[PDB]
């Protein structure tokens, strides 16, 4: 059974790797440096871009919400 | 082990045949053909006086079984508990068997019906309904036993030995009969289920559907001689007629639980009688003259006014009552179970309806052929 758990970990490592690769190729550059203006609750924030345009984000995105602060 | 089944080999018709026949299987590490005979040998006609021996034998066999069905275990420990007849430990004992097989197999309900079976005789109400609800909530993701239902229904049939379990019993009594289909029980077992059901149906407060009166394989097929009046009375309610000679003729029988509710039952028949008439109505003449309703139910005109008042109150009609003319205009939203002749009749009307719908379609397509485009 130890081998079976190892097989599950090995599969998880490839999928974790595959998800990581898709996120890695979608991180890319350049980033528009914006300024989070607030956080409406109803996981979605109201970014006010540095280009002087505001853009509500349905999903805050590739970050942990709790980390993001007004 | 082998000696124990040798010493307690007695108590079974064909001592060597009853026990040592299966002993050959256990030696070759198999555990299926034993129990069925064990259940069969516990189903074998006996007082089960070897229960203590069989208990130990089952306990011994079950102690190092680790394969036999907990249904037989319960079916044998219940046969045990029905044979040890010691409810004090039965709850305690059935619980330990339950805990000893704690996988998803639904043996606790049977133990709950074992607490059912023995706590439905000792402390039969306080938490038994919980002993049901826990089963009902748990009894999901797997409708394969069909006994989890029955004992609750039976315990609700035992709980049918309570105030507010008649319609719940009839609704559940019908439910159970579907789960187990074949005879697979004495004609007495089946005919008993039909009688307590019909007697419940005629008594149930919230049930006047009576759909399975003729379509239920058991109640319809069974009970052709033994108190067949029920099928007549049950067939009576689908007709609503006065029939009060029968209700009296069946009153000679089933004196208990029917005389005590003749006032309720008479009200029920009166109630269905209205639905019967407005069904028999020619549809267009959906109105019902006060006299016709009062004559069918032999109820005086002063109370046909209130009879419709009820029947329309529960939800068995969606009409309106007139008094200047006293014709109760009728509009139905409460359908009834059907019959071959009823359906044959219902289809013959529908053939006419499609004939008219076809005719008017032709009279439009032909007329507007140029414009039809």
């Amino acid at each position: 059974e130890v081998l079976r758990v190892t097989h599950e970990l090995q599969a998880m490592k490839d999928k974790i790797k595959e998800n990581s690769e898709k996120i890695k190729v979608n991180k890319t550059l350049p980033y528009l440096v914006s300024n989070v203006i607030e956080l409406l609750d109803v996981k979605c924030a109201v970014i006010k871009t540095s280009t002087r345009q505001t853009y509500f984000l349905p999903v805050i995105g590739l970050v942990d919400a709790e980390k993001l602060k007004p | 082990v082998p000696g124990f089944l040798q010493q307690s080999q007695n108590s079974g018709p064909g001592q060597p045949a009853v026990w040592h026949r299966l002993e050959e299987l256990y030696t070759k590490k198999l555990w299926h053909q034993l129990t069925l005979q064990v259940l069969d040998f516990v189903q074998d006609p006996c007082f089960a006086q070897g229960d203590g021996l069989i208990k130990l034998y089952e306990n011994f066999i079950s102690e190092f079984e680790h394969r036999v069905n907990p249904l037989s275990l319960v079916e044998i420990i219940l046969h045990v508990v029905r044979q040890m007849t010691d409810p004090n430990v039965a709850l305690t004992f059935l619980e330990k068997t339950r805990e000893k097989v704690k996988s998803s197999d639904e043996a606790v309900i049977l133990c709950k019906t074992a607490i059912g079976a023995l706590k439905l005789n000792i402390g039969d109400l306080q938490v038994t309904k919980e002993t049901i609800e826990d089963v009902e909530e748990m009894l999901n993701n797997l409708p394969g036993v069909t006994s989890v239902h029955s004992r609750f229904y039976d315990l609700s049939s035992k709980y049918y030995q309570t105030i507010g379990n008649h319609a719940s019993y009839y609704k559940d009594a019908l439910r159970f009969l579907g789960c187990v289909d074949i005879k697979d029980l004495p004609v007495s077992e089946q005919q008993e289920r039909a009688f307590t059901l019909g007697l419940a149906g005629l008594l149930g407060e919230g049930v006047f559907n009576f759909g399975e009166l003729l379509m239920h394989p058991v109640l319809e097929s069974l009970r052709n001689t033994d108190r067949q009046w029920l099928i007549d009375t049950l067939y009576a309610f689908n007709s609503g007629n006065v029939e009060r000679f029968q209700t009296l003729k069946t009153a000679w029988g089933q004196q208990p639980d029917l005389a005590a509710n003749e006032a309720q039952l008479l009200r029920k028949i009166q109630l269905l009688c209205l639905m019967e008439m407005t069904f028999t109505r020619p549809a267009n003449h959906r109105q019902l003259t006060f006299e016709e309703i009062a004559k069918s139910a032999k109820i005086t005109v002063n109370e046909v006014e209130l009879l419709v008042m009820k029947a329309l109150s529960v939800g068995l009609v969606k009409g309106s009552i007139d008094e200047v003319d006293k014709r109760v205009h009728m509009t139905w939203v409460q359908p009834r179970v059907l019959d071959l002749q009823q359906i044959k009749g219902m289809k013959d009307r529908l053939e006419f309806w499609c004939t008219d719908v076809k005719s008017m379609e032709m009279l439009v397509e032909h007329q507007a052929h140029d414009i039809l485009t």
Partner: protein, 191 residues
């Protein structure tokens, strides 16, 4: 080296739960498939093996795959809680076999017959007749309680490939204490 897709049919019926074989039948099948699946991939690295449960239904738990991890992993939670149906098992194994991703591999099937098979003798032979026409070699190995070397089963292997056929063996394992060693000695290295 012989390019072949091994569509192993592992039993999971209820009788598969009584361990006439020391620890249990299932481990015997679970140990047995461990060697047959590993035996095939070792023989040829371009091979592929899948498994079909045969009790209560014909589930296709793992389609025809080369990677042996999936077959081994899927073996777990095989939960022997059904009734064998060998009449259909071979067909579904063959019909799934017909979907061989590569069209070159020879055909070789391993059936784990561990329960009494309730199949008309006429039906089994007709199934064998269909196999002969389509050139599939299937090996039958019996476990646990069963009418020893069932006449219906034995007729199956004989008509499977006779008249100096490949010899798709009806390897009968000695009931009682015995590992896949019998299953690995004869059938696994020569089918």
């Amino acid at each position: 080296m012989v390019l072949e897709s091994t569509m192993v049919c592992v039993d999971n019926s209820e009788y598969m739960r009584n361990g006439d074989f020391l620890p249990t039948r299932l481990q015997a099948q679970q140990d047995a498939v461990n060697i047959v699946c590993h035996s095939k991939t070792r023989s040829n690295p371009e091979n592929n093996v899948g498994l079909i449960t045969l009790a209560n239904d014909c589930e296709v738990l793992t389609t025809l795959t080369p990677d042996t991890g999936r077959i081994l992993s899927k073996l777990h939670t095989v939960q022997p809680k059904g009734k064998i149906t060998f009449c259909t098992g071979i067909r579904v194994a063959h019909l799934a076999l017909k979907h061989r991703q590569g069209k070159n591999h020879k055909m070789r099937i391993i059936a784990f017959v561990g329960s009494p098979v309730e199949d008309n003798e006429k039906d089994l032979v007709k199934l064998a007749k269909r196999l002969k026409k389509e050139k599939v070699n299937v090996d039958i190995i019996n476990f646990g309680e069963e009418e020893v070397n069932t006449e219906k089963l034995t007729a199956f292997v004989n008509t499977l490939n006779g008249k100096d056929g490949t010899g798709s063996h009806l390897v009968t394992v000695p009931p009682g204490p015995s590992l896949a060693d019998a299953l690995i000695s004869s059938p696994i290295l020569a089918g």
